[PDB]
Amino acid sequence: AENLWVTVYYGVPVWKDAETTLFCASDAKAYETEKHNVWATHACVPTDPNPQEIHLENVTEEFNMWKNNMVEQMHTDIISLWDQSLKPCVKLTPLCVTLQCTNVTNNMRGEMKNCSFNMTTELRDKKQKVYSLFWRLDVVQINEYRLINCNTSACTQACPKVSFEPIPIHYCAPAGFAILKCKDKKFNGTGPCPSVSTVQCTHGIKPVVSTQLLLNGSLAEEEVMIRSENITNNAKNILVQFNTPVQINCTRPMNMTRKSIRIGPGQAFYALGDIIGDIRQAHCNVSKATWNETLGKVVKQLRKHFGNNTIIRFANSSGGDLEVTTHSFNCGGEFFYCNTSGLFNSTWISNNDSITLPCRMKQIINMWQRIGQCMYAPPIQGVIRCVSNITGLILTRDGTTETFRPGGGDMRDNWRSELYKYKVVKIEPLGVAPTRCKR
Amino acid sequence: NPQEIHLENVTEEFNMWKNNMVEQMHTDIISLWDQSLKPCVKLTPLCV
Amino acid sequence: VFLGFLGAAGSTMGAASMTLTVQARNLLSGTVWGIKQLQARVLAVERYLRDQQLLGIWGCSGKLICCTNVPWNSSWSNRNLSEIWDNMTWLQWDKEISNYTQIIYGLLEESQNQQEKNEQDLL
Amino acid sequence: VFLGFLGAAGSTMGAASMTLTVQARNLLSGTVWGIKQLQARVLAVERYLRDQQLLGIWGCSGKLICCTNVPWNSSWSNRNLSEIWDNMTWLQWDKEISNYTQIIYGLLEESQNQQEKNEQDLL
Amino acid sequence: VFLGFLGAAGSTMGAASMTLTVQARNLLSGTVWGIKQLQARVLAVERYLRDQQLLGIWGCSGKLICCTNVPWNSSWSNRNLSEIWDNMTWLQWDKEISNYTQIIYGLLEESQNQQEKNEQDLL
């Protein structure tokens, strides 16, 4: 009656923040992509055609994109996706031989090398006098050349069957856990979210390994978004998300050749033969009309944080390592490294053609800072062309006015631009509460 | 204990040419092979 | 009104208690990287048999709702019946009673252990 | 007459219901290739707690047999009592009611969710 | 007097039966070498659902204590009530009844299988 008794309730809406082992989901046409397991999807779970989504009315839960563990579990998963794909692939241990190299047939600036070397054939007897063709970033001289990795990391050659094409990846959580999706149009990834909804598996997140220029990411809503961990600190990167995508084209207009010198028994190295056609380099195009309006759309957002009548300038990379300074990205297999001195050369005050960007190329790579050893991606025949979406930028600030320069390096930032609206909780269905019942 | 129970009155349609115990037996014997050769002596220098 | 899984998280505890069967239906749900899901779908059922074993050793066994002969102490945030079940949510509530949850869990499994031995006498 | 596991698969549903405890006793049963059995004996218990959780959220909990306050709809193959329990087998039956099994499963867990909240009133 | 896990192993069966909830609370408890614990914490729950399934198919379901309508045979070590519950321990007892445990386990699950079918008649 007037004295109250405890009661057990099982299946209550009660959750606390926690971290659990997250898994994958990836449609079923992605499994038809096959091609000897492209990237990750093998025994991974297929996505059911039910996409369940439940808007939790009245609920307000404080997110935090800069402390989100789906990042550390996505980064380290992609790290180990790399290595599992290289363990049973051909290893280039006997490819650290002395390279006698020359220019490329031109008529100027040297960019490529026509290299000849000795080589183990299939038999452990007679050698082989065969020639390859390496970019300048692949090799280095010694006082005659050698590969640029031989004085560091033992090397392994990417298998030619697998594809480095970013496919959608849906992360999930098991039973007793759930994932919350914030669904408002203006959220800097930190603080309380008014319209919280719950989901079982996130939207398709293509793991695009890029620097400086965010590629093929989710578009922002209404106004372009400016996200930072500490805007007063000039030591934290400033994530940007676009509303309108910026169109970027990139060709590799060199009709190159694939030579297959057999370093048997079994294994076989894929080199670059003679070049069919003109000596050109790879270039990425950005339309001059799109990049001017999108640049001013960001700086009106930068005035919201750095003073109303302030002057915002942009310059290229301060320097240091190669990856930080260039727009590193994959498309068609090759790895481009592009100069963004032309996309960040602006000075904004308080109030019809293309922008072509020079791109290098490299076969031997050490990805995500230090992981996965080297990897000599095999050469690619024909003219490679691909279009990408610029859906965000990675900017840094220098230490009246303020300047901003592009950055990257740490690959945990690329995931945050897709995981800002997600977080992980555990369901605690056992809550006690009083009422006037007794047994 | 070899337990065996005759299900009287029951009639069930088999199909030997669509049986998955085959595909799970073949691919098991396939991987029985390789697991038995991974830590064995490799004749790479015997192509002289 | 099937609002869905956790559909009544901002609804009052009285309002949410109509959804108790909607949060517990989806509580169990039925080479590397393929083990990401194994070591995680194992952690999904130990979480279940940890909760069900509390429901078992209390006077509940059968699910969803269940009373106990433990008197509620006034120092566990002394609200009223109309201040809890008509003006509070389960998230907001387990925040005040997060200090006392472990204290309370003992009495339920001990007050029930007195009831069963007394049950064997009267048989 | 202990016919054994699935011993009454061709026996009538009335005849088979005497074996219900013989089919459910052997339902749970207590380096690579050694994982063939691990990932399979894990799939052997999720199959168990998926069924037991339906038995739990219905008016059953306790096993083998159990009634419900759901009226049986005539459009679910309108047979008679002597046409089902004396002239049909469980295999033959779940063939006609394979279309409606998912429809029916909802009512049991919802008709039971109305009974428990009403149970808390009358306490 | 919470003696602890197995705290009453030398206490009489009557004395130990007050600890039944202290031995069953800690019965479930919530790259290589990291699999030493996985294949062992899996063997920790099959041990649980093997015991709970016997408790389920008997007249117990609900835990700790539970009667049955099986008459106790005199040839299973004919002691008296004051010779068992006041002068013997559970270890010492299951030593005399280790021969008959399998014989007895059958009657409980069959005497219960007669009770449920009779229960469906009288409904």
Ligand SMILES: *[C@@H]1O[C@H](CO)[C@@H](O[C@@H]2O[C@H](CO)[C@@H](O[C@@H]3O[C@H](CO[C@H]4O[C@H](CO)[C@@H](O)[C@H](O)[C@@H]4O)[C@@H](O)[C@H](O[C@H]4O[C@H](CO)[C@@H](O)[C@H](O)[C@@H]4O[C@H]4O[C@H](CO)[C@@H](O)[C@H](O)[C@@H]4O)[C@@H]3O)[C@H](O)[C@H]2NC(C)=O)[C@H](O)[C@H]1NC(C)=O
């Ligand atoms: C942001 O997102 C965009 C959109 O997804 C993405 O653009 C994609 O660019 C890549 C280039 O890196 C494109 O990939 C290649 O496209 C060409 C052209 O395909 C034609 O043919 C298809 C018919 O299937 C038509 O539908 C299509 O319209 C074109 O006309 C293909 O030739 C490529 O195929 C090869 O790669 C596939 C996967 O890597 C393999 O499955 C396939 O078998 C091919 O491999 C082999 O082919 C030959 C054997 O027959 C062999 O000789 C070759 O040497 C090779 O080994 C590939 O599909 C992709 O299509 C673009 N996306 C779309 C939707 O078209 C951007 O790249 C992305 N941005 C970033 C930074 O990633």
Ligand SMILES: *[C@@H]1O[C@H](CO)[C@@H](O[C@@H]2O[C@H](CO)[C@@H](O[C@@H]3O[C@H](CO[C@H]4O[C@H](CO)[C@@H](O)[C@H](O)[C@@H]4O)[C@@H](O)[C@H](O[C@H]4O[C@H](CO)[C@@H](O)[C@H](O)[C@@H]4O)[C@@H]3O)[C@H](O)[C@H]2NC(C)=O)[C@H](O)[C@H]1NC(C)=O
């Ligand atoms: C990177 O560097 C390597 C250097 O090793 C280049 O590879 C060489 O490329 C040249 C092309 O100029 C090749 O030279 C040519 O060889 C042809 C093959 O000769 C065969 O035919 C005769 C029968 O007459 C056989 O007896 C003989 O054994 C061969 O089987 C010749 O036909 C070519 O002759 C032509 O060019 C000369 C040029 O003066 C003309 O005068 C002639 O009339 C005729 O038209 C020519 O000599 C050479 O063989 C290649 N070497 C190897 C090892 O393959 C790569 O091309 C280079 N890559 C790039 C991109 O520059």
Ligand SMILES: *[C@@H]1O[C@H](CO)[C@@H](O[C@@H]2O[C@H](CO)[C@@H](O[C@@H]3O[C@H](CO)[C@@H](O)[C@H](O)[C@@H]3O)[C@H](O)[C@H]2NC(C)=O)[C@H](O)[C@H]1NC(C)=O
């Ligand atoms: C092959 O390459 C050579 C160079 O190695 C090319 O010859 C070069 O031709 C350019 C013009 O096309 C010359 O530049 C000229 O300089 C004068 C100043 O003296 C200026 O007034 C002109 O307007 C022009 O800019 C350059 O001097 C000349 N170099 C040499 C070494 O002769 C040649 O055209 C190329 N041919 C092919 C087929 O590739």
Ligand SMILES: *[C@@H]1O[C@H](CO)[C@@H](O[C@@H]2O[C@H](CO)[C@@H](O)[C@H](O)[C@H]2NC(C)=O)[C@H](O)[C@H]1NC(C)=O
């Ligand atoms: C590939 O190997 C051959 C040996 O078969 C090298 O030829 C020798 O080169 C040295 C100097 O480099 C000379 O002194 C010898 O007279 C050469 N002939 C022999 C040993 O028979 C050849 O230089 C190598 N090619 C390279 C390293 O690019």
Ligand SMILES: *[C@@H]1O[C@H](CO)[C@@H](O[C@@H]2O[C@H](CO)[C@@H](O)[C@H](O)[C@H]2NC(C)=O)[C@H](O)[C@H]1NC(C)=O
């Ligand atoms: C391996 O070789 C590379 C290239 O020769 C070395 O990288 C150079 O490191 C110095 C550090 O003082 C830089 O100034 C050069 O610019 C680097 N070269 C290039 C091409 O980037 C690397 O240090 C060597 N590693 C060793 C010897 O352990």
Ligand SMILES: *[C@@H]1O[C@H](CO)[C@@H](O[C@@H]2O[C@H](CO)[C@@H](O)[C@H](O)[C@H]2NC(C)=O)[C@H](O)[C@H]1NC(C)=O
């Ligand atoms: C992200 O946005 C939130 C608002 O959604 C900002 O929160 C405010 O922070 C200031 C301090 O900088 C407080 O004085 C306000 O009371 C906060 N308001 C709200 C509604 O949270 C937060 O500062 C923003 N963070 C960044 C890095 O931009």
Ligand SMILES: *[C@@H]1O[C@H](CO)[C@@H](O[C@@H]2O[C@H](CO)[C@@H](O)[C@H](O)[C@H]2NC(C)=O)[C@H](O)[C@H]1NC(C)=O
């Ligand atoms: C690049 O951006 C364009 C935006 O125009 C994307 O095209 C849109 O895709 C969404 C769904 O992905 C559709 O709902 C829109 O209707 C599309 N726009 C138009 C004009 O048809 C395109 O998918 C993006 N490509 C990427 C991210 O790879």
Ligand SMILES: *[C@@H]1O[C@H](CO)[C@@H](O[C@@H]2O[C@H](CO)[C@@H](O)[C@H](O)[C@H]2NC(C)=O)[C@H](O)[C@H]1NC(C)=O
């Ligand atoms: C790049 O060069 C190759 C030759 O190595 C070209 O392949 C030829 O393609 C035409 C028609 O496309 C065929 O008639 C020839 O028989 C092909 N030759 C060989 C050796 O296969 C290829 O077309 C060139 N790339 C482009 C874009 O034209």
Ligand SMILES: *[C@@H]1O[C@H](CO)[C@@H](O[C@@H]2O[C@H](CO)[C@@H](O)[C@H](O)[C@H]2NC(C)=O)[C@H](O)[C@H]1NC(C)=O
């Ligand atoms: C990037 O390439 C695409 C196509 O490869 C270009 O889109 C074409 O634009 C022209 C007009 O400029 C149209 O006539 C074509 O129909 C378009 N093609 C398609 C497939 O839509 C685009 O303009 C290029 N942009 C840049 C910046 O290079």
Ligand SMILES: *[C@@H]1O[C@H](CO)[C@@H](O[C@@H]2O[C@H](CO)[C@@H](O)[C@H](O)[C@H]2NC(C)=O)[C@H](O)[C@H]1NC(C)=O
């Ligand atoms: C950033 O852009 C500046 C130009 O705005 C580049 O500065 C040049 O650097 C080279 C060194 O290779 C010097 O020889 C030139 O004299 C410099 N020009 C000026 C005007 O100072 C700089 O190299 C660029 N850096 C990057 C990383 O792209």
Ligand SMILES: *[C@@H]1O[C@H](CO)[C@@H](O[C@@H]2O[C@H](CO)[C@@H](O)[C@H](O)[C@H]2NC(C)=O)[C@H](O)[C@H]1NC(C)=O
């Ligand atoms: C990236 O682009 C900048 C500018 O477009 C390049 O800077 C040039 O450097 C050379 C030195 O070899 C100078 O002679 C030019 O005057 C510079 N250009 C300008 C506009 O100042 C730079 O070399 C390019 N590459 C890198 C890696 O920064």
Ligand SMILES: *[C@@H]1O[C@H](CO)[C@@H](O[C@@H]2O[C@H](CO)[C@@H](O)[C@H](O)[C@H]2NC(C)=O)[C@H](O)[C@H]1NC(C)=O
């Ligand atoms: C940044 O942009 C300015 C112009 O917006 C470039 O200025 C060039 O200046 C020279 C003479 O000083 C002119 O002859 C050129 O025509 C100007 N370029 C253009 C595109 O108009 C400046 O070089 C750019 N900086 C970099 C590093 O590229």
Ligand SMILES: *[C@@H]1O[C@H](CO)[C@@H](O)[C@H](O)[C@H]1NC(C)=O
């Ligand atoms: C390659 O080209 C560059 C152009 O600057 C030249 O200096 C170098 O000597 C060339 N290499 C050879 C081996 O001729």
Ligand SMILES: *[C@@H]1O[C@H](CO)[C@@H](O)[C@H](O)[C@H]1NC(C)=O
């Ligand atoms: C941001 O940076 C400033 C200065 O670097 C520091 O004083 C402050 O504590 C940081 N964190 C904030 C403002 O949350």
Ligand SMILES: *[C@@H]1O[C@H](CO)[C@@H](O)[C@H](O)[C@H]1NC(C)=O
């Ligand atoms: C386009 O960019 C130029 C700089 O080259 C700038 O002066 C101009 O204001 C921009 N146009 C608009 C409409 O912002």
Ligand SMILES: *[C@@H]1O[C@H](CO)[C@@H](O)[C@H](O)[C@H]1NC(C)=O
């Ligand atoms: C900047 O100026 C606009 C109008 O000129 C004003 O609405 C806005 O509040 C100002 N922002 C400040 C003062 O931070």
